[PDB]
Point group: D2
Chain length 332, copies 4
């Protein structure tokens, strides 16, 4: 399968690295599109402020990138419809710019010639939002516009599902203490959200989270029961979802932790990790899990109010899931 | 009343500034004790990384500080019992070192000659823990060892009280996204708490909060119902308490916000502020409130699960309360 | 005189706050143009992450800001030629967008009807670059497109003049340890400068400084003898210029300091401050000086190689100079 | 040879991790002494905020660390004279506590039974200060109390030697933009140095550097010609030395670079690296070099005033040199 990445930013670049690291024979990234030159994309791929140096040899010509001797065409076409997908024989497009999340816009890749599109964020009018650990068995070959939801949703949806199935979720609220992203501002600058307009590394910033409504999409049984928010803090990568749910059946920290441990060893293996050590955010950077269930934080008040917490590398854990979904598509 | 400050650190210094700013005729700070020289204390009082320059003229001799022409004796006596309180005619001592929180240790000031001691943190074996907005009408002249609780407790106890009185609190959990303090570490260094041992400005650090058990002390009706934790983040000052409570009577965001607004205008006036603007942490630095109720964050799920959030300048808001308590003592 | 501010960003906003504080009757700010709406501009004017809350009352309508009952029209015109300067009766325009630095662009404001334009950055094709303390006396009424140079130039040029005057300059190099700005990035993102493309708050970033060339524009005598670079670091505001200069006359630390103190009490009074206390960056935020000579850093080796440093609030010290220049055009 | 590490801090821990990575058979680390317990030392060895997880398996008993099945005894003896070096058969001790820098203190390890002591900082009364790339050939078997100087000295001294060699040095000044360290403070707290007393992560802090004097210890020829200072900034690791030097011979940027590249491919191979890409601090974390010559910063004005810069991972580049010195004593 020939793959194309639209938007070689934080997610687009890490998705490429992961693909390069996996060495899957059936996945060939043939093109990369952004709004800049090959020199700049080469440099940004090579050096990373959070994730260290790219393992491979990176070179560039005026029109392409050369990674370990393989040439990848680079374009700077802000309009997806102008992209030579059809000509390049492009099968799947990873939509990671952040601006083409509506079905109408994403559809432009299919018009330009690609078969399926994966939007690396919550979407509007998509065929399906797939969160591995929740509903990847609903994906069908007829789905062309696919969404992988947000990082916070992947960090907690699989956990919400097991808690619901074991104790029954009545009401619930999550708060994600999240690192800043390129959607924020260095210093106070205009932005649609007046809080995200404020200096990123200087403030504790309450704002919104895609997880709020996305979880109900993958775990329908919980629709209308959960809500949430985000508090962006001065860390460049690494987050933690703090979930408080009112459950139906009585429990204990001991039991909640045991069911989770079971899950991470089984159905959730490699998706949700299990931790019982006093770790901090810098310790989870580079992990591939969608979330790491922190057993040292589990708490129950009155047998029914329970707090559970999930750590996650918002950039890396998520990109891994994007590549998994891409592999899912190789099976149809 | 002649007052003495033991521990001229972040809290000790701000308490002095506030006292200096209030210009209360009946409060004379006659001594300051620490573990350093007058030159260093003079400099630290004068320049502050978070709160700006001290308004007054500060000078120093080998044995004292001279603020606007008034001399304040300075000692470097690590043992409170050796302090010349009796001789100096010291009435009230502000215990702000952080190491004399047990009744036995605090009692040393009374042995050295002072009448009453105010511990600026949760205490052990104290006569009374007073949180203004919750139980300042329990303070009696027979109380010599007084505690003002922690900053997080003052940020939320007054709010917890009104919520309980209006809707009835069943179960509840709070999480405080808190700035780092001098109890943490610049870079990974030994500490009793393995998470607080980690680099302060580089990590999202879950840890403990004094508010967890201190709230039940001032609002007895809620004993055994609330629990909580802290997540220290890379900001030098400014915090927010995120409380999620299961309430008895059905409500709405509209109602919860209205009762709070009423309170801030009444009984809680000047203690708990009310906000409905999209502010961030840097905007609350320098406020005197114990907490600022953020109306833009209030949320209710299923008429009974409610989230309320309180902002606070953990250094300044709290020191103001310490001075208020000191004034309370002038009335007996 | 009627004034308009083009680009209500960090500088644009600070210039206005200063104009408002000075209460100069001969200055009426009648228009403000940016690229966003009034609600956003009102919120950004009211709250600041570094400089705290605006002293006045701020309201807004669909097309104007109302500060203390006075109305300022607000436009969102990215093309200066389409601005109604002629109709608004705009005499002077403060060009602080950062994108209209060459004469061809700056002129669009004149074409639109304004009389004089002050660019808050180095320019190309300007009639004069004026650095108060260096060449303000070269300002002629015929000057129509004026530049105030950059903040680093203003922090060190007046000092360079004096030093050259007293000991004669042979060669010199300056390095400014500079707070980050909005020209930088939150996380690794494309930028012309590949170093400024990197995560601003987590890297020590070598880059360029507009003072490398501009110093000679205002102190012609040192033309071809200086050069410099910048090192952007993780602070939101506050910078320091480290100048190492090879002088002609034999000196001593004492004489350089004495010569500078002399200057700051006379000719450079209110422009360059004098310091001899061990202060750090947070201590100089809010200062009106262009630079604060730090006597504690002065060093001379071989009686001829001298080091001097100048602290400065890159946003606020500079904006005061922008407003000073504006006041100069008032007497013409 | 049996080795003991006194002070398992940033350097102590890194020196050990390197020893462990090199797998040198002639080096057996048999003891580790600090001021805390095994559980804390084990946790701090395992997780690192800057350098990531330890590669091996770490366990602990009440009095020892067990790494990959090997046991290291752990002591908590603040007085080196009371350490059982004689009984443990300790040949060499790595003195990394930062408090036993003078000969009188360092000797307590010899009194306790060790043969040779390597201090990881500038010292007083040492037999020799050795900077590999400068004077390692002056190390004699008779040397018993050795110093590896400071990280800044190691980053620039080898370069100073070469430059002096090729163009002759007349005068020079260095300024290192340095990451903060554990000698600093989280928030304003007493310290000998009134500037280092300030909040480490929120200020640009001028302070001292051990390279101001030490460079001459290893390059005697430049004795009395250099001086320097430090500027501590809000980064956890990564530093850069900015050297402005007045040379004797007329040069050009090209020749200085060529001369340095030459050196790094030969004599300084593996000690000083060569760089010509636009890298930032985060890019040099994890490097083994003492300094990385940055060709993109080299500048010469007047054919004689030259600027050169050297990047370095102050913790890790230095520790590799500490272990290299240790390996040198092996051939004696
Ligand atoms: N950063 C995270 O933690 C994270 C995690 C999960 C999902 N996401 C989502 O993935 C998407 C990408 O976010 P990011 O953090 O990588 O952002 P980013 O801003 O670093 O990357 C956006 C990239 O796309 C490019 N781009 C923008 N418009 C373009 C256009 N019209 N055509 C082609 N290229 C264009 C930009 O130049 C940039 O390089 C967003 O929707 C985001 O919400 C981000
Ligand atoms: N910082 C906050 O947000 C905050 C808020 C509320 C309460 N508190 C509490 O107030 C107390 C002080 O904390 P802080 O943040 O001001 O800390 P700090 O570490 O800045 O201040 C402690 C000061 O006391 C001095 N000291 C320590 N031991 C001494 C001794 N034996 N005798 C005399 N002086 C000694 C230290 O030199 C230092 O100057 C702590 O219990 C803390 O928990 C802190
Ligand atoms: N920040 C400092 O320390 C500093 C100091 C001295 C000078 N300057 C200079 O001042 C200028 C502005 O700097 P800043 O730091 O305030 O930047 P900034 O990005 O905060 O502000 C730029 C503002 O102008 C607006 N703008 C951009 N394009 C526009 C257009 N076409 N029409 C109208 N408005 C538009 C943007 O929305 C933004 O609000 C730059 O030239 C900069 O080099 C900055
Ligand atoms: N951090 C760097 O970049 C760097 C680089 C080169 C050299 N150094 C030098 O290395 C030394 C250690 O520096 P660090 O940054 O690792 O500091 P640090 O504070 O992390 O480590 C010091 C360690 O030694 C322990 N210690 C203190 N007193 C002790 C005693 N009496 N007995 C036994 N152990 C004790 C402390 O518990 C701590 O773990 C200092 O001299 C420093 O100047 C630091």
């Amino acid at each position: 399968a020939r793959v194309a990445i639209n938007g070689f930013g934080r997610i687009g670049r890490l998705v490429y690295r992961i693909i390069y690291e996996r060495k899957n024979p059936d996945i060939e990234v043939v093109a990369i599109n952004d709004l800049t030159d090959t020199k700049t994309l080469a440099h940004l791929l090579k050096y990373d402020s959070v994730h260290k140096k790219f393992p491979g040899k990176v070179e560039y010509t005026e029109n392409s990138l050369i990674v370990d001797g393989k040439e990848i065409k680079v374009f700077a076409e802000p309009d997806p419809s102008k992209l030579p997908w059809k000509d390049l024989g492009v099968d799947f497009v990873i939509e990671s710019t952040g601006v083409f999340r509506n079905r109408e816009k994403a559809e432009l890749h299919l018009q330009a010639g690609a078969k399926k599109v994966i939007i690396t964020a919550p979407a509007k009018g998509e065929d399906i939002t797939v969160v591995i650990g929740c509903n990847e068995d609903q994906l069908k070959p007829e789905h062309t516009i696919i969404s992988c939801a947000s990082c916070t949703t992947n960090s907690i949806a699989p956990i919400v599902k097991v808690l619901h199935e074991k104790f029954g979720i009545v009401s619930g609220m999550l708060t994600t203490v999240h690192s800043y992203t390129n959607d924020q501002r260095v210093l106070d600058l205009p932005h649609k959200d007046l809080r995200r307009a404020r200096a990123a590394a200087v403030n504790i910033i309450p704002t919104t989270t895609g997880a709020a409504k996305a979880v109900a999409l993958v775990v329908p049984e919980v629709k209308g029961k959960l809500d949430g928010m985000a508090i962006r803090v001065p860390t460049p990568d690494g987050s933690i979802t703090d979930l408080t749910v009112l459950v139906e059946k009585e429990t204990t920290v001991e039991e909640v932790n045991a069911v989770m441990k079971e899950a991470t060893e089984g159905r959730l293996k490699g998706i949700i990790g299990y931790n019982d050590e006093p770790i901090v955010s810098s310790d989870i950077i580079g992990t591939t899990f969608s979330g790491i269930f922190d057993a040292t934080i589990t708490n129950v008040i009155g047998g029914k109010l329970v707090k559970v917490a999930s750590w996650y590398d918002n950039e890396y854990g998520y990109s891994n899931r994007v590549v998994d979904t891409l592999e899912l598509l190789l099976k149809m």
